[PDB]
Amino acid sequence: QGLMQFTLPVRLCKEIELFHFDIGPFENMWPGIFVYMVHRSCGTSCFELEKLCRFIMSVKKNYRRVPYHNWKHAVTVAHCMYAILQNNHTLFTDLERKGLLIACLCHDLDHRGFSNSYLQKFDHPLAALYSTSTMEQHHFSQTVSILQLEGHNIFSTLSSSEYEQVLEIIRKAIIATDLALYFGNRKQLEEMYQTGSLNLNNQSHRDRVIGLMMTACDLCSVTKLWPVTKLTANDIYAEFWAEGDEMKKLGIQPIPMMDRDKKDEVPQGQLGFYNAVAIPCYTTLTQILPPTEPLLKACRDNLSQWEKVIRGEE
Ligand SMILES: Cn1ncc(Cl)c1C(=O)Nc1ccc2[nH]c(-c3ccccc3)nc2c1
Ligand SMILES: [Mg+2]
Ligand SMILES: [Zn+2]
C-alpha cells in the first residue's frame, strides 16, 4: 500500500455511486471495482491490498460458469450493498462495513445453478449435510475455507473477538440470502417498524435489518435500468429452465417458473414476484433506511415495464 488509491474512469467513478450502476461486461475490471468500493466504504486501512487481491481472485475461481449465479452476480450484489452503505454512512459499525461487502462477494460461492429444492429432490450430499438453507450453508463453508487458505486471511489484524463477530455477521448475512427466510424476516421487520419497537441497538434487530439489505442486494437486478433488468431476466430463466429440465429427468413436473414450455407466462410471473417479493422488500427497506428509496423507485419503474410487456406495448 498505502498511498495507492484505486481510481476508475470518470463515467464509472460517478455512476458507481448510484444504486442502478451496472458493473459492465469487462470481467477484468470487476476486482478493481470491488477494491475501489472496499476502500471508499471501509477505508484503505481495513484490508492488506496483497491479501485482499489474493482473496478476491480465489473467490472468483470458486464461482462457476453458470448463466446467473456467477462471479458477475457476486460483484453486482456487492455493489448494491456498497450503495446502501455509502448512503447510510453513520448507521453501520466498522466491523459491519468490513463484513458486509465480503459477505456479498461470497454469498453464492460454488453455486451450481440449482435451487435448495432441486438438491433435496436429487438427494445431493449437501442436502444431507445441511437440511435447511442448503446452498447458503455451503456458501458460508466455502467462505471460511477460502479465509483459511495461506495468505488469504484479510481479517488477520482483528482480535479473536472481532474476528468471531465479523464471521458471524458474514454467516447471518449469507444465510439471510435464502429467499425462503425473507418472507418472515420482512413480516417481523414490518410489524416492528409500525408498532415502533424497531431498535438498531438491539443486535437481534440489526441482524434482521442486515438480512433485508442482503435480500435487497441479492434481488437488485429488479432495481436496474429496464434493458439491464430484461437481459438479466434471460440469465435467471436459463438456470430455472435447466433446473426444470433436470426435474423432468427425475420424473417430476417442475413448477411453471422452471418449465421452459411455459415461457409465454414469464411476464405474469414477473408481476407476482415484483408484487410478492421485490416491492415489499424495497418498501420495508425504504421505511427503515430512507436513503435507499431509489431502489424502490427503480423497482416500481421495472414493475410498470413488465405491465407494458403484458399489454403488448413491448
Ligand atoms: C428477477 N429475479 N431476481 C431474483 C429472482 Cl428469484 C428473480 C425472479 O425472476 N423471480 C421469479 C419468481 C417467481 C416467478 N414465477 C415465474 C413464472 C411463473 C409462471 C410462468 C412463468 C414464470 N417467474 C418467476 C421469477
Ligand atoms: Mg443464493
Ligand atoms: Zn445471490
Curated annotation (Swiss-Prot):
Top-level lineage group: Eukaryota
Binding-site list for 3',5'-cyclic AMP: H69, Q270
Print the domain comment field: The tandem GAF domains bind cAMP, and regulate enzyme activity. The binding of cAMP stimulates enzyme activity. Composed of a C-terminal catalytic domain containing two divalent metal sites and an N-terminal regulatory domain which contains one cyclic nucleotide-binding region.
Q: Which residues bind a divalent metal cation 2?
A: D108
Its subunit composition reads:
Homodimer.
Which cysteines in this chain are paired by disulphide bridges? none
Expression tissues:
Abundant in the putamen and caudate nucleus regions of brain and testis, moderately expressed in the thyroid gland, pituitary gland, thalamus and cerebellum.
Traced from the root, the source organism's taxonomic lineage reads: Eukaryota, Metazoa, Chordata, Craniata, Vertebrata
Please name the source species: Homo sapiens
The record's disease note says: Dyskinesia, limb and orofacial, infantile-onset: An autosomal recessive, early-onset hyperkinetic movement disorder characterized by axial hypotonia, dyskinesia of the limbs and trunk, orofacial dyskinesia, drooling, and dysarthria. The severity of the hyperkinesis is variable.
Catalytic residues of the enzyme:
H69 (proton donor)
Q: Where in the cell is it found?
A: Cytoplasm, Cytosol
What is known to happen upon mutating D108A? Answer: Loss of activity and of zinc binding
What's this protein's name? cAMP and cAMP-inhibited cGMP 3',5'-cyclic phosphodiesterase 10A
Functionally, this protein is described as follows:
Plays a role in signal transduction by regulating the intracellular concentration of cyclic nucleotides. Can hydrolyze both cAMP and cGMP, but has higher affinity for cAMP and is more efficient with cAMP as substrate. May play a critical role in regulating cAMP and cGMP levels in the striatum, a region of the brain that contributes to the control of movement and cognition.
User: Where in this chain does the record put each PDEase domain?
Assistant: 1-313
Say which family it is in: Belongs to the cyclic nucleotide phosphodiesterase family.
- Covered range within the whole protein? 723 to 1036 of 1055
Which of this chain's residues are annotated to bind a divalent metal cation 1? H73, H107, D108, D218
Q: Where does 3',5'-cyclic GMP bind?
A: H69, Q270
Show the coiled coil region(s): none
